[PDB]
Design a protein around this nucleic acid. Structure first.
Lengths: 106, 56, 90
RNA sequence: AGCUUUGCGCAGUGGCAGUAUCGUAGCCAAUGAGGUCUAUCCGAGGCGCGAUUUGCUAAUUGAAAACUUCCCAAUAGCCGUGACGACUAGUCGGCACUGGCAAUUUUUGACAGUCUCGAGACUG
């Protein structure tokens, strides 16, 4: 329950961009988001006291159709030093886990 | 192909049952049926495909 | 066909056997076994995986941990034990 | 107004799927493709090339098979023994245990089974 998703979650589309350079794409994700029509957020998941990114990052785009089009265009696009693979963010929270448990028994 | 279809039907009947109802030991009456049953049940290695000396 | 007789331990042992449920100078009993925090004996692959995880300093991911926990729960449920519904439906 | 048809699309059940399902941008084709039966007869595409979207779940391998700081340590009985204080060598109250606590009155169990109308009887 890390309090970090309260700044980018605004009923938008979250895209998980992985397979990126560990020592690269620190702020290049921001450039990609700015290129994207929504240009809302391009947060990169990194570990504290590590000096490098943790891999996949969360790009929040307000426009859903624009986010889908960008994901189609940027799927496997060479960003930084490695092609970034874009997929859908999971966001499995405690309420989501409880709902999944309720739907599993029924 | 008929033995493979029978082994696939046995594997589908095993997979249709839940994990609490799935058996862990299979007794093959025919001797020429345990050989595809090891092939058709490769997703469940916890089951034992054993032969039978007494034919029911 | 042997029932559990009262005040007798040989009948339960027979039922379990029928069911198939069974220098200084010294002889040091050097016994080496692999166990876990749950106390269950570990397979050599599992013991090697635990040793490698402890040596590398990083454990398994959240998804792998959840899958392992679900598998352990399923194994516990299976080891703890639709005919009536099939008899009533027929 | 009730009813019905052809064609079409949506939805749904069931079924099929490598002699199956399509693209074809190549060519030919009702101005006739292809025909061993019915040939002064039938009437549609045929031939080459090239294919067989998306989500979920599970399992295997591997140290790790990918979703947002993790780890480590700690907190949230009795009998006697040595001192301390009190009351007349003895007793009492608190402190820690350098030894013991499965042999009749308390904690290492004389317990368990059967039958009858809360109670009684039988056996090991």
């Amino acid at each position: 329950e890390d309090p970090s998703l309260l700044e980018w979650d605004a009923d938008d589309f979250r895209i998980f961009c992985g397979d990126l350079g560990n020592e690269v794409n620190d702020d290049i994700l921001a450039r990609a988001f700015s290129r994207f029509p929504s240009f809302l957020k391009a947060k990169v998941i990194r570990d504290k006291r590590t000096g490098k990114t943790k891999g996949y990052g969360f790009v929040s785009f307000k426009d859903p159709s624009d986010y889908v089009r960008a994901m189609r265009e940027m799927n496997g696009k060479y960003v930084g030093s490695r092609p970034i693979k874009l997929r859908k963010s999971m966001w499995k929270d405690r309420n989501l886990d409880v709902v999944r448990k309720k739907q599993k028994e029924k | 192909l008929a033995k493979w279809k029978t082994a696939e039907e046995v594997a589908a009947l095993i997979r249709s049952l839940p994990v609490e109802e799935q058996p862990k030991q299979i007794i093959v009456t025919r001797k020429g049926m345990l050989d595809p049953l090891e092939v058709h049940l490769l997703d469940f290695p916890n089951i034992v495909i054993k032969g039978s000396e007494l034919q029911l | 066909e042997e029932p559990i007789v009262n005040r007798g331990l040989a009948a339960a042992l027979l039922l379990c056997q029928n069911k198939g449920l069974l220098k200084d100078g010294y002889k040091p009993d050097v016994k080496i076994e692999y166990v876990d925090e749950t106390g269950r004996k570990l397979t050599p692959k599992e013991a090697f995986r635990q040793l490698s995880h402890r040596f590398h300093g990083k454990g398994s991911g959240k998804m792998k941990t959840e899958r392992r926990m679900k598998k352990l729960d399923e194994e516990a449920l299976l080891k703890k034990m639709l005919g009536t519904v099939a008899l009533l439906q027929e």
